[PDB]
Amino acid sequence: SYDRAITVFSPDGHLFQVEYAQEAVKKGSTAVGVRGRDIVVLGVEKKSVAKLQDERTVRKICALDDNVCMAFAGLTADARIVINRARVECQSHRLTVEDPVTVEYITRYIASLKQRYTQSNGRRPFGISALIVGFDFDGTPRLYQTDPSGTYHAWKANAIGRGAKSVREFLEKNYTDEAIETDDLTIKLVIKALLEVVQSGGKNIELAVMRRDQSLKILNPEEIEKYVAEIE
Amino acid sequence: NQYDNDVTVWSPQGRIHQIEYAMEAVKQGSATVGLKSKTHAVLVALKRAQSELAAHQKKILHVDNHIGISIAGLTADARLLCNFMRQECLDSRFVFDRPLPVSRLVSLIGSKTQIPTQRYGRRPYGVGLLIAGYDDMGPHIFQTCPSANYFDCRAMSIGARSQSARTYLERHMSEFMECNLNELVKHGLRALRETLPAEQDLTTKNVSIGIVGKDLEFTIYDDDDVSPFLEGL
Amino acid sequence: GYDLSASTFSPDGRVFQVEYAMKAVENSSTAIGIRCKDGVVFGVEKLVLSKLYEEGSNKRLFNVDRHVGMAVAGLLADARSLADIAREEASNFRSNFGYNIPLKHLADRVAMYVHAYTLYSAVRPFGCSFMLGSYSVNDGAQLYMIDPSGVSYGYWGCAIGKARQAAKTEIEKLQMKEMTCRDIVKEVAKIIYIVHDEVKDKAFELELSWVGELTNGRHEIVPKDIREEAEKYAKESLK
Amino acid sequence: TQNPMVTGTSVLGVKFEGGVVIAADMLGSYGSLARFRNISRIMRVNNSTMLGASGDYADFQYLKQVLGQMVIDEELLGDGHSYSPRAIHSWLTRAMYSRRSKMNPLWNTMVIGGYADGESFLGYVDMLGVAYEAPSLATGYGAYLAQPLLREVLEKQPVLSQTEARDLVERCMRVLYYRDARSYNRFQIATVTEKGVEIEGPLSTETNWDIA
Amino acid sequence: TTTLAFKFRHGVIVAADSRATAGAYIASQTVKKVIEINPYLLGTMAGGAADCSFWERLLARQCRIYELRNKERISVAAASKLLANMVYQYKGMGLSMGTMICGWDKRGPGLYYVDSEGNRISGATFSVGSGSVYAYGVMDRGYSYDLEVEQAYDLARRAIYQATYRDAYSGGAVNLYHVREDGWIRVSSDNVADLHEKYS
Amino acid sequence: TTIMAVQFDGGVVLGADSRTTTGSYIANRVTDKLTPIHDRIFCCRSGSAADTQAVADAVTYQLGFHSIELNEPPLVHTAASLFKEMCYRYREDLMAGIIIAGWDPQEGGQVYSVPMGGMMVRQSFAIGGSGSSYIYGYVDATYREGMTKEECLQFTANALALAMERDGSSGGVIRLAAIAESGVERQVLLGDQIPKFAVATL
Amino acid sequence: MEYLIGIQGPDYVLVASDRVAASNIVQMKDDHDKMFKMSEKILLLCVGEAGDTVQFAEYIQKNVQLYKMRNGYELSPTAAANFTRRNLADCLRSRTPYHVNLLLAGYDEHEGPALYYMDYLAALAKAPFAAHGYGAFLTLSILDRYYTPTISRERAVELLRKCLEELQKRFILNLPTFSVRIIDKNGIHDLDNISF
Amino acid sequence: DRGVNTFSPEGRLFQVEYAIEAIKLGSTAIGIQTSEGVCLAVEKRITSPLMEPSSIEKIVEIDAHIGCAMSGLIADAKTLIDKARVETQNHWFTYNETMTVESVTQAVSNLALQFGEEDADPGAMSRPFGVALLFGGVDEKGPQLFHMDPSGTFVQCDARAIGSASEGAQSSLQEVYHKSMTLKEAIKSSLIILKQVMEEKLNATNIELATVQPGQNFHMFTKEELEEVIKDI
Amino acid sequence: FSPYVFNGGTILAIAGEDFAIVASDTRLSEGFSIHTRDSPKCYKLTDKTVIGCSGFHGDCLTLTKIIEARLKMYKHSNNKAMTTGAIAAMLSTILYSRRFFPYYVYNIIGGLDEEGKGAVYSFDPVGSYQRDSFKAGGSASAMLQPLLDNQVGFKNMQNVEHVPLSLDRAMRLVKDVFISAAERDVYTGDALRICIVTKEGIREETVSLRKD
Numbered sequence A: 001s002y003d004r005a006i007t008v009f010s011p012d013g014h015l016f017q018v019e020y021a022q023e024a025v026k027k028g029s030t031a032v033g034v035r036g037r038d039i040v041v042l043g044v045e046k047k048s049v050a051k052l053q054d055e056r057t058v059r060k061i062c063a064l065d066d067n068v069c070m071a072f073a074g075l076t077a078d079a080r081i082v083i084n085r086a087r088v089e090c091q092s093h094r095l096t097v098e099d100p101v102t103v104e105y106i107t108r109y110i111a112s113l114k115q116r117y118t119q120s121n122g123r124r125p126f127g128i129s130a131l132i133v134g135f136d137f138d139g140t141p142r143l144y145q146t147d148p149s150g151t152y153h154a155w156k157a158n159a160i161g162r163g164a165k166s167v168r169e170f171l172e173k174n175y176t177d178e179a180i181e182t183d184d185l186t187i188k189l190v191i192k193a194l195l196e197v198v199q200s201g202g203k204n205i206e207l208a209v210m211r212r213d214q215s216l217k218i219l220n221p222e223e224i225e226k227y228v229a230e231i232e
Numbered sequence B: 001n002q003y004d005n006d007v008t009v010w011s012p013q014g015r016i017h018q019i020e021y022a023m024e025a026v027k028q029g030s031a032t033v034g035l036k037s038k039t040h041a042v043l044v045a046l047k048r049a050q051s052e053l054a055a056h057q058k059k060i061l062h063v064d065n066h067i068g069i070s071i072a073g074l075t076a077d078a079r080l081l082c083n084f085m086r087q088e089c090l091d092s093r094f095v096f097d098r099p100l101p102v103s104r105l106v107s108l109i110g111s112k113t114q115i116p117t118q119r120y121g122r123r124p125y126g127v128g129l130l131i132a133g134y135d136d137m138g139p140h141i142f143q144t145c146p147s148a149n150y151f152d153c154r155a156m157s158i159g160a161r162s163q164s165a166r167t168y169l170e171r172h173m174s175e176f177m178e179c180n181l182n183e184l185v186k187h188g189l190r191a192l193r194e195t196l197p198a199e200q201d202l203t204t205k206n207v208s209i210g211i212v213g214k215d216l217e218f219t220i221y222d223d224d225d226v227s228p229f230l231e232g233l
Numbered sequence C: 001g002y003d004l005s006a007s008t009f010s011p012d013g014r015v016f017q018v019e020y021a022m023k024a025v026e027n028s029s030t031a032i033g034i035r036c037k038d039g040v041v042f043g044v045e046k047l048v049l050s051k052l053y054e055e056g057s058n059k060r061l062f063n064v065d066r067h068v069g070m071a072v073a074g075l076l077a078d079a080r081s082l083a084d085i086a087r088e089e090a091s092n093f094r095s096n097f098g099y100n101i102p103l104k105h106l107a108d109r110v111a112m113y114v115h116a117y118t119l120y121s122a123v124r125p126f127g128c129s130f131m132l133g134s135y136s137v138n139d140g141a142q143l144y145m146i147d148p149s150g151v152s153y154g155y156w157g158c159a160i161g162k163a164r165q166a167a168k169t170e171i172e173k174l175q176m177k178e179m180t181c182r183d184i185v186k187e188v189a190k191i192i193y194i195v196h197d198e199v200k201d202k203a204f205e206l207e208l209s210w211v212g213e214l215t216n217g218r219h220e221i222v223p224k225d226i227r228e229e230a231e232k233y234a235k236e237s238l239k
Numbered sequence D: 001t002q003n004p005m006v007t008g009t010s011v012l013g014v015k016f017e018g019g020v021v022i023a024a025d026m027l028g029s030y031g032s033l034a035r036f037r038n039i040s041r042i043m044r045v046n047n048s049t050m051l052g053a054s055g056d057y058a059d060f061q062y063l064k065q066v067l068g069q070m071v072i073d074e075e076l077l078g079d080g081h082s083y084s085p086r087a088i089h090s091w092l093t094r095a096m097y098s099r100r101s102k103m104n105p106l107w108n109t110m111v112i113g114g115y116a117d118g119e120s121f122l123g124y125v126d127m128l129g130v131a132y133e134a135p136s137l138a139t140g141y142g143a144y145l146a147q148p149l150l151r152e153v154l155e156k157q158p159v160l161s162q163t164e165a166r167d168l169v170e171r172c173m174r175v176l177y178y179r180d181a182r183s184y185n186r187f188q189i190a191t192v193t194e195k196g197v198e199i200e201g202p203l204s205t206e207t208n209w210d211i212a
Numbered sequence E: 001t002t003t004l005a006f007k008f009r010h011g012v013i014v015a016a017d018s019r020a021t022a023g024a025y026i027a028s029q030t031v032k033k034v035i036e037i038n039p040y041l042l043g044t045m046a047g048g049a050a051d052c053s054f055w056e057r058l059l060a061r062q063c064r065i066y067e068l069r070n071k072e073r074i075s076v077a078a079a080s081k082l083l084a085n086m087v088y089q090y091k092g093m094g095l096s097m098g099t100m101i102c103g104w105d106k107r108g109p110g111l112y113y114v115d116s117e118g119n120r121i122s123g124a125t126f127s128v129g130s131g132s133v134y135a136y137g138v139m140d141r142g143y144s145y146d147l148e149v150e151q152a153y154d155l156a157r158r159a160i161y162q163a164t165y166r167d168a169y170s171g172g173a174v175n176l177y178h179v180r181e182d183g184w185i186r187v188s189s190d191n192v193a194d195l196h197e198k199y200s
Numbered sequence F: 001t002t003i004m005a006v007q008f009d010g011g012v013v014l015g016a017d018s019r020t021t022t023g024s025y026i027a028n029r030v031t032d033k034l035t036p037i038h039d040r041i042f043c044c045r046s047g048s049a050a051d052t053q054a055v056a057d058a059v060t061y062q063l064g065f066h067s068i069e070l071n072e073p074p075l076v077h078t079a080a081s082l083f084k085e086m087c088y089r090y091r092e093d094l095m096a097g098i099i100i101a102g103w104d105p106q107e108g109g110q111v112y113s114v115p116m117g118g119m120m121v122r123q124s125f126a127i128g129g130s131g132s133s134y135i136y137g138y139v140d141a142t143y144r145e146g147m148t149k150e151e152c153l154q155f156t157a158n159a160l161a162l163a164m165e166r167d168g169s170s171g172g173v174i175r176l177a178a179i180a181e182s183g184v185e186r187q188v189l190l191g192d193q194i195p196k197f198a199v200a201t202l
Numbered sequence G: 001m002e003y004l005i006g007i008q009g010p011d012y013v014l015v016a017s018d019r020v021a022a023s024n025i026v027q028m029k030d031d032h033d034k035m036f037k038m039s040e041k042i043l044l045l046c047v048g049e050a051g052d053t054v055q056f057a058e059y060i061q062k063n064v065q066l067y068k069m070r071n072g073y074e075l076s077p078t079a080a081a082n083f084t085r086r087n088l089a090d091c092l093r094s095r096t097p098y099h100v101n102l103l104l105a106g107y108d109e110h111e112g113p114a115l116y117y118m119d120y121l122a123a124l125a126k127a128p129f130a131a132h133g134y135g136a137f138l139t140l141s142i143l144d145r146y147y148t149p150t151i152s153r154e155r156a157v158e159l160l161r162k163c164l165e166e167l168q169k170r171f172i173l174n175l176p177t178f179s180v181r182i183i184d185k186n187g188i189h190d191l192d193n194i195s196f
Numbered sequence H: 001d002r003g004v005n006t007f008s009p010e011g012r013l014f015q016v017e018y019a020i021e022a023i024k025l026g027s028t029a030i031g032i033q034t035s036e037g038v039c040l041a042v043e044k045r046i047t048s049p050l051m052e053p054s055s056i057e058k059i060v061e062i063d064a065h066i067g068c069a070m071s072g073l074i075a076d077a078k079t080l081i082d083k084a085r086v087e088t089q090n091h092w093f094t095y096n097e098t099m100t101v102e103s104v105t106q107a108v109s110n111l112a113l114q115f116g117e118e119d120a121d122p123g124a125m126s127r128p129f130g131v132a133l134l135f136g137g138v139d140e141k142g143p144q145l146f147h148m149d150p151s152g153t154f155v156q157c158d159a160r161a162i163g164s165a166s167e168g169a170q171s172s173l174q175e176v177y178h179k180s181m182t183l184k185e186a187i188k189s190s191l192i193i194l195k196q197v198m199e200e201k202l203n204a205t206n207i208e209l210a211t212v213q214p215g216q217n218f219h220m221f222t223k224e225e226l227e228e229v230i231k232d233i
Numbered sequence I: 001f002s003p004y005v006f007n008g009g010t011i012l013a014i015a016g017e018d019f020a021i022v023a024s025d026t027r028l029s030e031g032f033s034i035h036t037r038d039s040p041k042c043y044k045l046t047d048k049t050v051i052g053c054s055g056f057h058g059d060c061l062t063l064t065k066i067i068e069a070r071l072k073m074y075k076h077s078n079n080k081a082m083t084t085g086a087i088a089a090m091l092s093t094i095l096y097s098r099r100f101f102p103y104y105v106y107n108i109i110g111g112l113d114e115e116g117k118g119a120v121y122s123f124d125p126v127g128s129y130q131r132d133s134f135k136a137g138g139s140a141s142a143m144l145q146p147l148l149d150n151q152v153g154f155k156n157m158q159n160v161e162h163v164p165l166s167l168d169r170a171m172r173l174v175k176d177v178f179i180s181a182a183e184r185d186v187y188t189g190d191a192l193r194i195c196i197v198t199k200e201g202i203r204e205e206t207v208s209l210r211k212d
């Protein structure tokens, strides 16, 4: 059994492995998320279509449960592992509580898993940051972001991955109750935020939304093109 | 150097540098004094406060009704060792229904502290103790070090500037046997005072006393309860 | 960096960690043991670091069994660990085979235990050399010495410590094969006093133990009267 | 021992002014068969303690070995501390109770005697962990035959001398030989005093009237 | 023992006698068989006293841990599921436990029955214990979802009194509890002798 | 079964019958129940055949390793103690009683008894097995102190013959073995060699 | 004992179960549900020892939903039945066996309706109709008499009423109300309760 | 290339020193002990306006009479908080009494320094907890406040400040503190110090405040009360 | 092999305004025999608590040792003595730790509460405990309980002033009930031990009973 301390302190009190995981997520693809009045949206920048890759098998937006989804940025495989663990946790919670999971519960579980991985023996920190959105039973929309360090915060709009700072600045400058007036305006906001980073635009966008008491829906390429045209 | 990173590495001079580093860790703590008469054992410790508003750290800890220890060094290691002592004493009472002799407890402590000093990726307990107790063979005072070595002492002081207290105890060791409890406590306090700098004094808020005797279960005196001994300087 | 592990062989074919353990034991005080017709006698130069220590602290003479003694040199924690191991081995032998452990067997077991710590990088060699002494009618007086490397050899006379050479020189001029324990205690005191260095070392206390016919095969400290006579004789001899 | 194989009969005990006396017949019985007739059922734990055991003799040997090893290991240290008879009694109680809890009992019933600090000690340890200290003890069939005589004498005279205690033990052994069917004529007497532990060789109940 | 609880418009009522017997010897007549897990949730005891007490105390511990972690009070369904899953691991080992969990969650009044045999079923009217049948008689003949508060109190008291009258292993004092949206309150503890004098 | 060992000045004399039964059927009528544990230590096996054989093999292994480790002949007490430990630890699973006899320089000829339960006692003469119950009186009455090797051999043969005559689990041949400094002198009495005692007719 | 029943038709499966939960002699509940929704087109009916039924059914429900989320397509009725049988058989010889009697009903887009029978020994079997409990002894004959593979859902409901009326007339236990459900290409529909 | 359990020549554990260093990068937290209760304040340290302030849980509740304020690595503090809650509830279950503040602090501190590389556990901890804690509550001995560092050393503090602004916040506390301070005075002083030391402006959305009193349970100030206090001061 | 044996013994506890009484007989029995007459069943835990154990003696001793060890552990880890309620809760937890191998012990606790008033806690072998004002356990529980209910509880008596219990009256009641029990129950007799818990300390008394 490998029993070595992969993550250790350094002078000035820095867990260099966690900083390297932050760098890894920084080098990853771009992801955006905005919390609306009655809708939650997630956007992801596709690196390249490649014209021969099935879009079904490269999706970066996943549904942990019926009422919770999440998009990630970083290393894909760690994202898959975290997704599977979160799904199992959601099912166990529904089994032993007889109520659907809340967004806060599952984000806290994911953050705890990441913390355990950055303090255990013989294992490196996860290299992903996840934006978790959904609807609680009360109907209040939610949006949380989790980092490799195990820190989770509740945001009304955030970006992770490449160009996180630029998209976050755009969102801060262009977020208001007016922009969240309608669902279409919210999707337009997400597309506009993503277009500040993605070069081609339109083709290189993956967009999914969830409405209240409705299943997660991936917008078809035609709809994304229509919204892009509307923005311009 | 390459000989001062693991406890399983011998220096070309036959020294295990980590053990001396733990010894230094012990020497960097507060000063304690322990001394014994023909019928009593006294532990006197000088508590240090991080700030003016922080309660002075405790240094005399119970083990059983007849054993007490003063600590000098890491506090976590001190608490671990104290828990081991308490468990051993409780086991002795549960099995045999007799108090555990102090010497056997010290031997068990030494055996436990040896193991880290010989295995990879383990550190010596960075704490030095002064066990005081009363057994069938009279009062005892023992000193423990991170090197898994212990000594039976008439009097001893360990901690920062403990050499002055040691010199005082050596000079005045003759009278210790034939001394009342108050006289012995005053001798211990005088030994502890010699460790303090010129511009510092022994107040009721930075002195602790632990007495154990034939007809006196181990007791810890602190705060205003140490005023009677301090009077008479 | 060929001397950072007991699991590494130097080009010349040496395990330098065991050498450093030998040096560590060589830096301690001297302990001598002489085998005689009746039994064995031990002597230790117990240096006193300060006058605060009681007479009897840091005892370097142990009883690992009813009929087996143990005189140690080097790191005292390791010596105590090895003494506990010897006691455990003797108890196991008595429980299983139903009689007192022969000294040669006990030496073999303890040497094998010591040797197991000179092979891996997960453990360091013991920094202590010790001697064992036992007497029985069936087996007679026996004396053994075990070093950190694990080598166990029988000795008519042994000396472990910084003054080993001088002690061997003084022991070598004794007809121990024909003398008795009573006549050997005085010689042990003489040797300990001679090898002692006053300029370097400050003060010392003589610790003596023996096991022989006079003791009915039991290891115990030499009585106070005998020890005092031995010290007087040693002081007179030194003059 | 789920099924005992070779077992001993009662063990007596009475404390006098300055020690204790224990008696135990030399017999190992394999279910109504005096198979072994020269086995000692009294142990000298140390200079101030003794132990006589009834029940299974193999378990008595096991306890003998363990207790002897413990006493030895203590002596090797040479710290000036002696296992008091109370300490040995408590250790025996704990061991028997632990074995009972594990469901692997030690089939025995021991009587511990000692003289320490100018005070006599007389304890009883059962198979199930029952422990108590009384002036007089009698295990096995002795509890029905020998105990009444000892208790009557003690109630009439709380403090007995050594000779009176020995005479009482001899009378009780005679009664046991008369009435117990697993008893033997040859028996041992053990005494603990300030001088130490002494065990008397094979005595006899020759004072056995048989007027029929 | 005889304990009952029924859901009506203004909450859920809980009642229970206070007799504990060791064979035919009445160990005590002052046994509290209603546990206060939290000011908005409570349980009932029936069967082995030690088993019920221990496992209900453990349930209270777990519920407090849940409240501390999630910052929200536990629901009746969650508590019942926790108790059922916790006692299931000891199925067939002899646990004699029959309990009712009553409270007011975000979904309104709740009432669940948990047994050592593994049962976990919600319902409107429940009664568990030796005198369960006798209490059921009166409770069913007098129960109505639209009962007034005093009428509900009287129904519970009468049911427990009849169960005590017809059952040897039940008796003592009739404790009565009432749950509302703002917690529960203990309304009275009337001795069976006084109730007998009042009714007869 | 009938196993016996007697002790004389210089050595021991062992003896056992040669019958192995599985109810009322004699599976083996020439079985050898005297097993050499070492050069001058022998064991007589009574009880379950499998248990006794396994214990004998284990003790042989342990004692051989012990002898190799200490360059000296073993002690009979050591073999007895090993048997005692193995029988006591596994008393609930084993059904085997053993008698150990042999010679060692320290204490000479010795005989030890290890019945069910793991007891160990030294005796001048020991008997065991199902048929031992029928020769207790004979050995008690006709045993004498300071017997000679030949006298001990005759005594063992006679008592064993009585046991075979009266016990249905004992029969066949009487396998004697005398152990002393010289070595082991083994013997087998069969047919007319077995002692004969006349039976009554009225 | 409880009661289960299932009729498999050309393009649907009709299932029903009793709604009684009795402790010793008292019906402690009168509207119990013994049908567990494994997926959008699968139902599990469990009857047996208390505690075992709920534990087993909820465990299978969690596993099936986890499969659905992980892969994105729901498990087929045959796959779910085989998974249940494998789990039950594994638990059969352990120290914590489940004494639960099952009846799995589901609809598949390709294969079609399926009704599966499983006993506490984990012996899977597929039948056009099946029943559980002591009531099966009285309803299996009626089902054999009046059943045709081409039976409409209305006629199947009438046949179920016939079986439950026979239960009311002849069986000793009180089984007043029965829950009824039907699975078709559109999912699970909850039909009106059969009451007496 | 040195292991986690390694001693420097100065007799200190390198990992513990580095953990102490990491504390200095966290937010400032202040606590004050008074005869009327214990107050705790913290700095939220908001990064962007899009982050919900309600999600920054820097003051948490261990039991109905204990609260914890933390600075450093919050993810590390989560495990310690869970352990404290579990220990308090275990004590209540076993003894049917409320755990003392000192007992909870000791139980949480024992967890610290229980890390290693070889022969620790299948999932043992690899590094010290880089987070400092400030415990506060009311026990049989009255209101209490305790400070816990990564080294496992806990001390009773009358008024302590932990975080990046500890040096200077402690000076202000020394200047302002007196034994007979009231709860309102303590809250106002804590707010003043926090306003002085925070880089950003102080408002009702970027600070947390909690109090524990003998009568009232753990109470977390809402926007209304915070605004009232801010206006008053 | 039966792992249990009933050794008899009766325990009693009375709670008063400012005192608590714990009483037990001093007879240890086994079958029809009497082991000893000086085996008190009242054990002192702290300066304001006393625990009385009856039933299987070995289990009683083991439980008492465990309680003493746990009291010391709590004192060490909390720097304060345990209260009577804490002792009751710990004992309830300990007894249920062995639900499948229960302690064949009937327990009773008597001492002052935090406010300085008397308190009595009665336990079952499995762990169930209740705060009572009076309780008797052991062989003669049925004989002692009704009289206490009639006299101090004033049950089934009308027109009786409920004067609070006095210490002299409590001692008289304990002595009388134990004397009456000794006349009927075989297991109870020999002698009586009374422990009085007050703020001054714990006083002990002994009054003889029938030896029959």
Ligand SMILES: CC(C)C[C@@H](C=O)NC(=O)[C@H](CC(C)C)NC(=O)[C@H](CC(C)C)NC(=O)OCc1ccccc1
Pocket: E001, E002, E019, E020, E021, E022, E023, E027, E028, E031, E033, E045, E046, E047, E048, E049, E050, E052, E096, E169, E170, I122, I123, I124, I125, I126, I128, I129, I130
């Ligand atoms: C909550 C319970 C008191 C309900 C009560 C029913 O009437 N239970 C009982 O009466 C049970 C019946 C059993 C068959 C389950 N009887 C009992 O005797 C139970 C448990 C024993 C069997 C160990 N109660 C008991 O003996 O302890 C009573 C008690 C309770 C508190 C303190 C001291 C003594």
Ligand SMILES: CC(C)C[C@@H](C=O)NC(=O)[C@H](CC(C)C)NC(=O)[C@H](CC(C)C)NC(=O)OCc1ccccc1
Pocket: F001, F019, F020, F021, F022, F023, F027, F028, F031, F033, F045, F046, F047, F048, F049, F050, F052, F169
């Ligand atoms: C140690 C033996 C060499 C002596 C020999 C002589 O009786 N033993 C035996 O005959 C014992 C009987 C026992 C009840 C004494 N028999 C055995 O050991 C037989 C022998 C077969 C290999 C033929 N096998 C065996 O395991 O025993 C059969 C048996 C199994 C269960 C109950 C009763 C008998």
